[PDB]
Amino acid sequence: GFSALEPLVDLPIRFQTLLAAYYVG
Amino acid sequence: LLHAPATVCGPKKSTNLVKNKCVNFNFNGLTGTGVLTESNKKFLPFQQF
């Protein structure tokens, strides 16, 4: 499937996650 | 004039909208000359130009 990713928020100024089956690219 | 690229925004001196004549427009970054008619094209909520 094809789906374009719209901008969510641009913020002016080791990766972990918490709660699964998540990917990482 | 260092560290992050800080923006201090600026003055907000807005004028009335022009219906149909050749005027000089300053649309918050865009400068030119033309007629500002109404539109039928539909934009997106994140798209500005």
Swiss-Prot record, chain A:
Subunit structure: Binds to host ACE2. RBD also interacts with the N-linked glycan on 'Asn-90' of ACE2. Cleavage of S generates a polybasic C-terminal sequence on S1 that binds to host Neuropilin-1 (NRP1) and Neuropilin-2 (NRP2) receptors. Interacts with host integrin alpha-5/beta-1 (ITGA5:ITGB1) and with ACE2 in complex with integrin alpha-5/beta-1 (ITGA5:ITGB1). May interact via cytoplasmic c-terminus with M protein. May interact (via N-terminus) with host bilirubin and biliverdin, thereby preventing antibody binding to the SARS-CoV-2 spike NTD via an allosteric mechanism.
Function: Attaches the virion to the cell membrane by interacting with host receptor, initiating the infection. The major receptor is host ACE2. When S2/S2' has been cleaved, binding to the receptor triggers direct fusion at the cell membrane. When S2/S2' has not been cleaved, binding to the receptor results in internalization of the virus by endocytosis using host TFRC and GRM2 and leading to fusion of the virion membrane with the host endosomal membrane. Alternatively, may use NRP1/NRP2 and integrin as entry receptors.
Protein name (Swiss-Prot/TrEMBL): Spike protein S1
Organism: Severe acute respiratory syndrome coronavirus 2
Taxonomic placement: Viruses, Riboviria, Orthornavirae, Pisuviricota, Pisoniviricetes
Gene of this entry: S
